[PDB]
Enzyme design. Structure first.
Site, PDB file in Angstrom:
ATOM      1  N   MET B 144       0.812  -1.230   0.000  1.00  0.00           N
ATOM      2  CA  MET B 144       0.000   0.000   0.000  1.00  0.00           C
ATOM      3  C   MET B 144       0.853   1.293   0.000  1.00  0.00           C
ATOM      4  SD  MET B 144      -3.272   0.588   2.554  1.00  0.00           S
ATOM      5  CE  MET B 144      -4.546   1.820   2.328  1.00  0.00           C
ATOM      6  N   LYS B 145       2.143   1.150   0.244  1.00  0.00           N
ATOM      7  CA  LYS B 145       3.075   2.243   0.179  1.00  0.00           C
ATOM      8  C   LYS B 145       2.543   3.428   0.992  1.00  0.00           C
ATOM      9  CE  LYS B 145       5.260   0.724  -4.083  1.00  0.00           C
ATOM     10  NZ  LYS B 145       4.401  -0.380  -4.483  1.00  0.00           N
ATOM     11  N   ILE B 146       2.242   3.104   2.241  1.00  0.00           N
ATOM     12  CA  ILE B 146       1.593   4.106   3.071  1.00  0.00           C
ATOM     13  C   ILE B 146       2.567   5.179   3.540  1.00  0.00           C
ATOM     14  CG2 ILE B 146      -0.333   2.634   3.810  1.00  0.00           C
ATOM     15  CD1 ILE B 146       1.278   2.290   6.507  1.00  0.00           C
TER      16      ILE B 146
END
Ligand SMILES: Nc1c(F)c(=O)[nH]c(=O)n1[C@@H]1O[C@H](COP(=O)(O)O)[C@@H](O)[C@H]1O
Ligand SMILES: Nc1c(F)c(=O)[nH]c(=O)n1[C@@H]1O[C@H](COP(=O)(O)O)[C@@H](O)[C@H]1O
Lengths: 322, 328
Positions: B144-146
């Protein structure tokens, strides 16, 4: 149709502010709204039900139109959905007359699973009916093939006017976010430039290229990509997120990219200084300096009055600058 | 000495699974609209062979969302539940890939971007996919590459680690490394979680910030890797059987070599094999560790868009294992 650049300019002419209202409801906010409504005979939900565009939301409208006492006994599995959505409608109804834009941070709408995404869709539907320009703060980042899915979600499904993007992976992602080649559609984004967290200097200021700090390099590359995509010709733009608390950088960005669009969070809950931020980032087309206020409005028990005093204070400061 | 499913830190879960199946294949499950439509078409044309097989699997009864719909006969869905048809075929596509390929997977990585573009319906699918994998006890990554400020990122932590019960996620720490305090640690519950931070990515222009930016002749990606490890130490992750590792693209052979050389025992997740045409031999060689759960090789579309995903997955498993044996 008109494009975000034009939407912003026209609403600025109508309401004469640059306040961007942040709508980030947390679990405590929803729980407090439910409790207060329950103890106040649902006075705010009742007001919500009298507004016309509630009739135009997409998802489970019939549930949203039910009386709260019937939701609790006959549709109890929808209670959280109903109160979460009604909290959002209540904030929007109380404050939208003071807002140039609303910014919704995706993080607040995901943690319960699908239910908050239905709420988010309805919030976007409602703001769209109200013709209020929108920003989805989702700080998206990925490779080209993958980010197209965010483009679809944000610009086709929600019909947002803009989003936030983290371009650390590279700028070319913007080709698949701000542009749809097959449909010939163009969209706006704000890229992260200087953020509000206390350790933001670690990569944004302490890294450099040539004799420029990382945040300048990143701003310039975002602008190069806007040019490449011809966004401004299509009434769209790529702009910058610059923290309210980041006065030097705000001053630098506004001086060196004189006509850029800036979105500035960090006033209120994060203690940024409104006068200093708006003065350092000032532009006569003040839609180019959006002052985001989230929690200082949403966790204020008198949110209409909270929004009004930001609107009034922004106005006074805009006047001082000219 | 025995710990039940779900009651051990991710370091230990990976180690055990790697001992069990002897690979570092990470299968990526990124279903796109064409995939879902093609699955529905193929099942309609073949009397739903694969859906009927999904329906016999015991753990399908343990997923959280709309089991009532998921367990219906597929011809009943099409005729009587039109508004649930997309949910049903999307979810069954995912279960099918899992069923066909899991015996070869050290871990599954789901990219959140593929589960959001239709609104809520894909998030229900995603929750069921995670429930299903949890029941199978297969290590999971949510890609999700938060990134956000601490107060906001807590919400992603809750979604990923409490709601999905994911083992790990991907994280972009460009905003600051302190966000990790609110992702890999929950101070209310005193729980620790694992993450992979973006170090060197596979997009063609990834050098523009990751390599061009530097501090005193150390490029950004090295600085960012060091900062993340510094934070892992501070948080005591590895003493709690969790870790912070690195995303390093398959196609970034020199950076993979540097990372493995300078951080000998780090956990690496490496996408870009297959559809993105990374060199598998070079990637595995440069990233090699004898604990090869520390060099996960992600393959998504080369498996999921093959009409025979079990055989595609077996082929990649065998090719990886042959390269692992060459290293040793
Ligand atoms: N996108 C952001 C940034 F890049 C940043 O540097 N700082 C931020 O606060 N936000 C977001 O801006 C909002 C700040 O909200 P409030 O403090 O309640 O007024 C939240 O959605 C934050 O996640
Ligand atoms: N997370 C990623 C990175 F940091 C990166 O640098 N490159 C990537 O591809 N991914 C993801 O890894 C997967 C690549 O999938 P496949 O190409 O079908 O094998 C997708 O989910 C990508 O978004």
């Amino acid at each position: 149709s008109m494009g975000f650049k034009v939407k912003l300019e026209k609403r600025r002419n109508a309401i004469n502010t640059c306040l961007c209202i942040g709508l980030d409801p947390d679990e405590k906010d929803i729980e407090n709204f439910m409790k207060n409504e329950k103890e106040n005979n649902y006075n705010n939900i009742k007001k919500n039900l009298k507004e016309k565009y509630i009739n135009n939301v997409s998802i489970k409208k019939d549930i949203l139109l039910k009386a709260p006492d019937n939701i609790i006994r006959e549709e109890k599995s929808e209670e959280f959905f109903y109160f979460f959505n009604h909290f959002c409608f209540y904030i929007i109804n109380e404050t939208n007359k003071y807002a140039l834009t609303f910014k919704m941070n995706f993080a607040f709408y995901i943690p319960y699973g699908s239910v908050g995404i239905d709420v988010l869709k309805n919030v976007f539907d409602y703001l769209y009916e109200l013709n209020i320009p929108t920003i989805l703060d989702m700080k998206i980042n990925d490779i080209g093939n993958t980010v197209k899915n965010y483009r679809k979600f944000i610009f086709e499904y929600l019909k947002s006017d803009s989003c936030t993007v983290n371009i650390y992976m590279g700028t070319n992602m913007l080709k698949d976010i701000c542009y749809d080649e097959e449909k010939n559609k163009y969209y706006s984004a704000f890229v992260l430039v200087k953020t509000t967290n206390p350790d933001s200097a670690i990569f944004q200021k302490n890294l450099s290229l040539d004799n420029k700090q990382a945040y300048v390099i990143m701003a310039q590359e975002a602008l190069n990509m806007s040019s490449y995509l011809n966004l401004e010709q299509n009434n769209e733009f790529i702009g910058f997120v610059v923290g309210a608390n980041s006065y030097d950088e705000m001053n630098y960005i506004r001086t060196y990219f004189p006509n850029c669009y800036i979105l500035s969070p960090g006033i209120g809950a994060q203690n940024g200084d409104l006068h200093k931020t708006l003065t350092n980032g000032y532009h006569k087309s003040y839609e180019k300096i959006l002052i985001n206020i989230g929690r200082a409005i949403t966790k204020n028990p008198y949110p209409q009055k909270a929004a009004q005093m930001y609107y009034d204070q922004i106005n006074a400061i805009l006047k001082q600058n000219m």
